[PDB]
Design a protein around this motif. Structure first.
Motif, PDB file in Angstrom:
ATOM      1  N   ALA A  18       0.812  -1.218   0.000  1.00 37.13           N
ATOM      2  CA  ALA A  18       0.000   0.000   0.000  1.00 37.13           C
ATOM      3  C   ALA A  18       0.843   1.264   0.000  1.00 37.13           C
ATOM      4  CB  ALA A  18      -0.941   0.003   1.182  1.00 37.13           C
ATOM      5  N   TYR A  19       1.967   1.236   0.704  1.00 33.18           N
ATOM      6  CA  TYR A  19       2.874   2.380   0.696  1.00 33.18           C
ATOM      7  C   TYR A  19       3.467   2.595  -0.704  1.00 33.18           C
ATOM      8  CZ  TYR A  19       6.592   5.610   1.477  1.00 33.18           C
ATOM      9  OH  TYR A  19       7.419   6.692   1.326  1.00 33.18           O
ATOM     10  N   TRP A  20       4.120   1.571  -1.243  1.00 35.34           N
ATOM     11  CA  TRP A  20       4.888   1.749  -2.473  1.00 35.34           C
ATOM     12  C   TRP A  20       3.997   1.944  -3.697  1.00 35.34           C
ATOM     13  CZ3 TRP A  20       9.357   3.695  -2.075  1.00 35.34           C
ATOM     14  CH2 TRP A  20      10.143   3.426  -0.954  1.00 35.34           C
ATOM     15  N   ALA A  21       2.734   1.543  -3.604  1.00 34.72           N
ATOM     16  CA  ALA A  21       1.783   1.800  -4.670  1.00 34.72           C
ATOM     17  C   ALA A  21       1.573   3.288  -4.884  1.00 34.72           C
ATOM     18  CB  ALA A  21       0.468   1.124  -4.364  1.00 34.72           C
ATOM     19  N   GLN A  22       1.917   4.106  -3.892  1.00 37.34           N
ATOM     20  CA  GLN A  22       1.765   5.552  -4.029  1.00 37.34           C
ATOM     21  C   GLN A  22       2.992   6.239  -4.628  1.00 37.34           C
ATOM     22  OE1 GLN A  22      -1.238   7.028  -3.621  1.00 37.34           O
ATOM     23  NE2 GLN A  22      -1.795   4.861  -3.430  1.00 37.34           N
ATOM     24  N   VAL A  23       3.989   5.453  -5.023  1.00 34.50           N
ATOM     25  CA  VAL A  23       5.223   5.988  -5.588  1.00 34.50           C
ATOM     26  C   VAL A  23       5.349   5.490  -7.031  1.00 34.50           C
ATOM     27  CG1 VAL A  23       7.737   6.095  -5.368  1.00 34.50           C
ATOM     28  CG2 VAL A  23       6.300   6.024  -3.313  1.00 34.50           C
TER      29      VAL A  23
ATOM     30  N   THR B 242       9.393  11.885  -5.287  1.00 34.33           N
ATOM     31  CA  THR B 242       9.184  12.496  -3.984  1.00 34.33           C
ATOM     32  C   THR B 242       8.361  11.507  -3.174  1.00 34.33           C
ATOM     33  OG1 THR B 242       9.215  14.744  -4.850  1.00 34.33           O
ATOM     34  CG2 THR B 242       8.180  14.425  -2.713  1.00 34.33           C
ATOM     35  N   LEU B 243       8.924  11.010  -2.079  1.00 35.50           N
ATOM     36  CA  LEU B 243       8.266   9.971  -1.286  1.00 35.50           C
ATOM     37  C   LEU B 243       7.195  10.542  -0.360  1.00 35.50           C
ATOM     38  CD1 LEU B 243      11.345   7.786  -0.272  1.00 35.50           C
ATOM     39  CD2 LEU B 243       9.716   7.366  -2.122  1.00 35.50           C
ATOM     40  N   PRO B 244       6.062   9.835  -0.243  1.00 33.78           N
ATOM     41  CA  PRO B 244       5.066  10.212   0.753  1.00 33.78           C
ATOM     42  C   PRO B 244       5.500   9.856   2.167  1.00 33.78           C
ATOM     43  CG  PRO B 244       4.378   8.216  -0.374  1.00 33.78           C
ATOM     44  CD  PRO B 244       5.670   8.633  -0.999  1.00 33.78           C
TER      45      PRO B 244
END
Length: 330
Positions: free
Chosen positions: A234-239, A258-260
């Motif tokens: 779920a985290y890396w899906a936003q990158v 740019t990392l969330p």
């Protein structure tokens, strides 16, 4: 009594932190990796196989007037990253940041694995998990904290790790100037010998908070944050462009990203890890693929709140009769 010592990243990525420790009489100062995920205080020494020493400062017990061989005692440890060390044991005087323990077990390395040899900046480890994990045989030994506890003003130590900057380990007191807001305390299980606790959930960037119990350990000796595969995906899906690479050994992302941020729950409180804390830089020199600071715990067997998470907080390791953990923003 109390102690206070500065802890300093070993490199530009915060791969680990070193804290100066005085051993013996006269003092021999070694820079140790304080590790809340293990329970042995071991050092490079005059007994370490010569080919396995490369730049480390060594402890020489024969030069300490307070050193005594702990007759018949040996130790041997294997860490989660596959590294290892072993040797014999002395007792000696050990001081951290002005706090002194006499008769501390100082485990002298005869052998260390290559990862230790290759890291010239780490002279040994100082374990701060529960003494039930200590590997000395046939008589298990106590950690520095366990030995100091009764003398401390309060039976606690705190970790205040810096992002790309020095931080502080305090023993015996809580520095109320070192954090913002309040400290939220949460229950600890000592069943596995770790500072094991249950986070109440997570959020990715500005996303909604997911309430879900995540059991894991507070581990200053682990660099990264290791969480269940669902959470990590779920985290890396936003990158954009991030992916899990079996050849590299985890999630990588374009260095142009740019990392969330990543938020974890401590009871009803929230600790926010800024996106920049999750960047561990190029996978190899000059690469435009960067290594992620949040990785799957699948096949580790435990979730690990390592430095990536802990450095976003002021963390209280409360060693009262019923231990607890406290987290504050800072």
């Amino acid at each position: 009594s109390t102690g206070s010592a500065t802890t300093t990243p070993i490199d530009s990525l915060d791969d680990a932190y070193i804290t100066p420790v005085q051993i013996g009489t006269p003092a021999q100062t070694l820079n140790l990796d304080f590790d809340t995920g293990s329970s042995d205080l071991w050092v490079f020494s005059s007994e370490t196989t010569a080919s396995e020493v490369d730049g480390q400062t060594i402890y020489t017990p024969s030069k300490s007037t307070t050193a005594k061989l702990l007759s018949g005692a040996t130790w041997s440890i294997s860490y989660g990253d596959g590294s290892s060390s072993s040797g014999d044991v002395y007792t000696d005087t050990v001081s951290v940041g002005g706090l002194t323990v006499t008769g501390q077990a100082v485990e002298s390395a005869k052998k260390v694995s290559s990862s230790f040899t290759e890291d010239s900046t780490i002279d040994g480890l100082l374990g701060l998990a529960f003494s039930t994990l200590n590997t000395v045989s046939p008589t298990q030994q106590k950690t520095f904290f366990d030995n100091a506890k009764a003398s401390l003003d309060s039976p606690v130590f705190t970790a205040d790790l810096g992002y790309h900057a020095p931080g502080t380990y305090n023993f015996g007191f809580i520095d109320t100037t070192a954090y913002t807001g309040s400290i939220t305390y949460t229950a600890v299980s000592t069943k596995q010998g770790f500072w094991e606790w249950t986070s109440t959930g997570y959020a990715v960037g500005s996303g909604t908070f997911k309430s879900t119990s995540i059991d894991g350990i507070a581990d200053t000796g682990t660099t990264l944050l290791y969480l269940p595969a669902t959470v990590v995906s779920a985290y890396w899906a936003q990158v954009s462009g991030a992916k899990s690479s079996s050849s590299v050994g985890g999630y990588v992302f374009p260095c142009s990203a740019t990392l969330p941020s990543f938020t974890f729950g401590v009871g009803s409180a929230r600790i926010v890890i800024p996106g920049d804390y999750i960047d561990f830089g190029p996978i190899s020199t000059g690469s435009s693929s960067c290594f992620g600071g949040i990785q799957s715990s699948a096949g580790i067997g435990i979730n690990i709140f390592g430095d990536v998470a802990l450095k976003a907080a002021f963390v209280v390791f409360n060693g009262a009769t019923t231990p607890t953990l406290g987290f504050a923003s800072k």
